[PDB]
């Protein structure tokens, strides 16, 4: 039985979202690739390079025109005529637009593809621009986070395959299932926040008892994601559980909202 074609492209990025994806515990990324989708193009993992890789890209988007999911990691830079990110000798943005034209839907993996992430932080030397400001005629699902949670990435994929539809989204295009509530709305340290029980300096008695990290700059109260419920790396931990405040890494512009250690 044919598997849904997926084309995964990469603009300016650090590849954290790809790494997160392969961390998936259930389904294993192995089984996603072998059984759930047809990962037909992916610079990180594909055998073919150069002209062979160009041939795959062209053939897939032509043969499956209108029928493939386009996964985008990273973003296009508008600076230097787009040549801050070059693919096959041309601006990455050209490859993005070609891939986007034939996609049935687009998944914007990570804060990079969703909003801009670190390259878009002040002063944004490359004019890195999120996908939805360039591609304006396609369904875009934003899956923000730096990176998003591995089992959230795989859960969105399985949802799309199992249910044959896109996840329902909030007003920003984030899946309601995992971005409907704030970190702080499901945080196991909320008891301490409510009681005014705060870490005041690193490794103080409060820190050794798991007190709330708000006064250490935790941005949980304004950040939407599943870290405090689904957690990270097969439920093992999340930033706050291991003693660091939320940075806000799922939210648009989080790098430029002041020090991670201030209010």
């Amino acid at each position: 039985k044919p598997r849904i074609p997926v084309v995964w492209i990469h603009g300016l990025e650090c590849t954290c979202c790809t790494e997160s994806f392969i961390r998936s515990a259930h389904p294993l990324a192995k089984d996603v690739i072998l059984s759930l989708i047809s990962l037909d193009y992916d610079d990180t993992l594909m055998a073919a390079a150069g002209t062979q890789a160009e041939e795959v890209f062209e053939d897939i988007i032509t043969q499956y025109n209108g029928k493939y999911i386009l996964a985008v990691e990273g973003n296009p830079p508008l600076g230097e005529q787009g040549m801050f990110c070059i693919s096959s000798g041309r601006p990455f943005i050209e490859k993005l637009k070609r891939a986007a034209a034939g996609a049935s839907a687009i998944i914007a993996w990570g804060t990079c593809a969703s909003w801009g992430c670190v390259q878009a932080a002040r002063p944004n030397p490359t004019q890195a621009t999120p996908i939805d400001k360039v591609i304006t005629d396609k369904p875009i699902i934003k899956v923000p986070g730096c990176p998003p949670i591995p089992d959230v990435m795989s859960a969105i994929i399985t949802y799309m395959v199992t249910f044959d539809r896109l996840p329902d989204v909030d007003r920003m295009g984030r899946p309601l299932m995992f971005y409907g509530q704030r970190i702080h709305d499901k945080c196991y340290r909320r008891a301490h926040f409510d009681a005014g029980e705060f870490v005041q300096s690193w490794d103080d008695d409060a820190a050794r008892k798991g007190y709330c990290l708000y006064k250490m700059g935790c941005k949980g109260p304004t950040t939407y994601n599943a870290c405090s419920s689904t957690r990270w790396n097969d439920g093992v931990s999340f930033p706050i559980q291991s003693g660091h405040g939320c940075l806000g890494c799922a939210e648009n512009g989080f790098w430029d909202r002041g020090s991670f250690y201030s209010r």
Partner: protein, 581 residues
């Protein structure tokens, strides 16, 4: 067409030009061009970083305590290594000393990264250069079991297992949806494994893809998450509580038990799966001990890593040795000083950056990152590069040199440095490894050698993980729980003006961050990253970097299929996002 001589090579851009863009099975964006002569031998090699983001620019004006979080996002493959370099650099600038457990935990973070990164590189990035996946479909499952069992004690070796793996691959390919295998180089004459070895390799590819997810649970415990764990200036945020009320809110005995369980499984997987597979690739591809030597018999560099004495970055402390060899003189390992302005310098005469004088190299404390896209005549247009012009500016990667020498960094570099400084464990490991292959020492200075050293480093790091965990538990038994120093957390405690260097050995090689702090903010933040060295463009003397050199003189069976180019480039584990930052 021109010809010139450098580093014993004849750089000749006569003959057919071959373009490989994109380079795949790397991190990020690379372009490679070569010229081949009438014998299909490479006479010119051009390394080009096709991406830039500008973290050095973005870091200006940030709080030094925040810097680690920004620079961690230089790279999600070598995730954490930039955070470590950053906290090192800021601590070095301000004069912060961290508690022993913070240092130990940092070394655990780094060793975990080495294990994870090296394992994924071997299988998911480099593996398909050496394993003909489609050939696995012709393998005999019993003969596969027999091979596997002759090479390893690893449990998973039954004929039925290999049949099940083969059948899974058969059904995957049958419908024509070959996914990541589409339009590969399968059947290329340089694929030399017998079908049984390809099936064994492919099975292990799948096992490693599964298993790698477990390794980073160590990062999740101490650092909250992987990719991109959390750190602090002054140590780590993962406060410890073993035996007091509220241990549920801290690193407790149950959390440390988790870590121990991961360490043991990680060593077992590397020692019984990756190590035998690496030796098997050696056994079936011995000619690659003589291909892609490049700079590895001339110039190699390590800064050293894993300080075992907290806050001591000296030779007696670093478990992974530092040093430089130049001019092929491995009898004189030279000391490296990252403050010395005559040592590390970056040139941009062949890169897309402005300097006031592009004929001189700048030490990172005098570094400038002023992007200038100027490809000159590229046989197309500014927005359509048909052929880079390697006589002028051809990369987003700066050109680092050490005392003006072009250096190779990474696992092979580090192995050679440790070996020639007389590290007993390294000497013994290397000698034994090359003996088992019936190859001379010199065979390590090669594309095959880079892969062998990477695997042996995964084994080394897995061993060190246990050593570091044991040291942590020893401190906890002695009642030493401290994980952070906060004496100099507040900016009011810092020098008005200071600077510092944070260095380590990332999976790909020597890493440095140079930071200058003024008035509580980052005034300057310059990064020189291992792939910046290796993937370097040329300098004013026309000296070529590690990649260009390793590709020089290489025979290609089939010019249109760049398998030999991919083999050598992949052997260095290119991280282009790292290289350009």
């Amino acid at each position: 067409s021109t010809q010139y001589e450098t580093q014993g090579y004849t750089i000749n851009n006569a003959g057919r030009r071959l373009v490989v863009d994109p380079i795949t099975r790397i991190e990020g964006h690379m372009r490679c061009e070569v010229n081949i002569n009438d014998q299909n031998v490479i006479t010119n090699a051009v390394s080009c970083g096709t991406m830039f983001r500008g973290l050095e620019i973005i870091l200006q004006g940030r709080d030094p305590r925040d810097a680690w979080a920004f620079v961690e996002r230089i790279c999600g493959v070598c995730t954490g290594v930039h955070a470590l370099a950053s906290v090192y650099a800021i601590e070095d600038a301000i004069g912060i000393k961290v508690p022993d457990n913070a240092n130990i935990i940092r070394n655990i973070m780094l060793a975990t990264l080495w294990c994870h990164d090296h394992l994924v590189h071997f299988y998911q990035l480099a593996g398909m250069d050496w394993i003909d996946v489609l050939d696995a479909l012709k393998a005999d499952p019993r003969k596969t079991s027999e091979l596997a069992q002759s090479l390893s004690s690893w449990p998973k070796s039954s004929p039925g297992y290999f049949f099940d793996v083969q059948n899974r691959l058969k059904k995957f390919v049958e419908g024509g949806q070959l996914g990541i295998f589409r339009n590969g180089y399968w059947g290329h004459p340089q694929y030399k494994l017998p079908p049984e070895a390809n099936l064994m390799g492919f099975a292990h590819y799948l096992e490693a893809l599964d298993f790698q997810r477990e390794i980073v649970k160590i990062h999740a415990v101490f650092g909250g998450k992987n990719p991109h764990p959390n750190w602090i200036v002054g140590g780590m945020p993962c406060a410890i509580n073993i035996d007091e009320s509220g241990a549920v809110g801290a690193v407790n005995m149950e959390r440390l038990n988790l870590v121990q369980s991961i360490i043991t499984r990680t060593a077992d997987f590397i020692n019984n799966v990756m190590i035998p597979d690496a030796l098997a690739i050696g056994q079936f591809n011995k000619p690659w001990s003589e291909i892609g030597t490049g700079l590895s018999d001339k110039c190699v560099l390590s800064y050293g890593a894993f300080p075992d004495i907290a806050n001591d970055f000296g030779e007696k402390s670093l478990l992974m040795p530092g040093g430089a060899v130049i001019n092929g003189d491995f009898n004189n390992v030279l000391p490296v000083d990252l403050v010395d302005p005559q040592q590390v310098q970056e040139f941009v005469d062949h890169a897309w950056y402005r300097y006031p004088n592009d004929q001189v190299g700048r030490h990172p404390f005098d570094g400038i990152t002023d992007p200038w896209y100027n490809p000159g005549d590229v046989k197309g247009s500014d927005t359509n590069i048909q052929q880079l012009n390697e006589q002028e500016r051809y990369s987003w990667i700066k050109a680092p040199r050490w005392r003006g020498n072009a250096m190779e960094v990474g696992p092979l570099a580090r192995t050679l440095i440790a070996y020639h400084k007389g590290d007993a464990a390294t000497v013994e490991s290397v000698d034994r490894m090359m003996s088992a292959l019936n190859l001379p020492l010199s065979g390590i200075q090669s594309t095959l050698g880079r892969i062998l050293c990477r695997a042996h480093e995964a084994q080394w790091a897995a061993g060190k993980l246990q050593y570091f965990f044991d040291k942590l538990m020893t401190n906890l038994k002695n009642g030493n729980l401290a994980t952070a120093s906060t004496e100099k957390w507040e900016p009011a405690t810092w020098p008005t003006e200071c600077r510092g260097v944070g260095f380590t050995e990332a999976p790909r090689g020597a890493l440095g961050h140079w930071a200058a702090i003024r008035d509580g903010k980052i005034d300057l933040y310059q990064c020189v990253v291992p792939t910046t060295w290796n993937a370097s463009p040329r300098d004013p003397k026309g000296q070529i970097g590690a990649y260009e050199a390793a590709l020089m003189n290489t025979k290609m069976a089939i010019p249109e299929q760049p398998l030999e180019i991919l083999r050598t480039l992949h052997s260095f584990d290119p991280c282009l996002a790292c290289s350009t930052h």
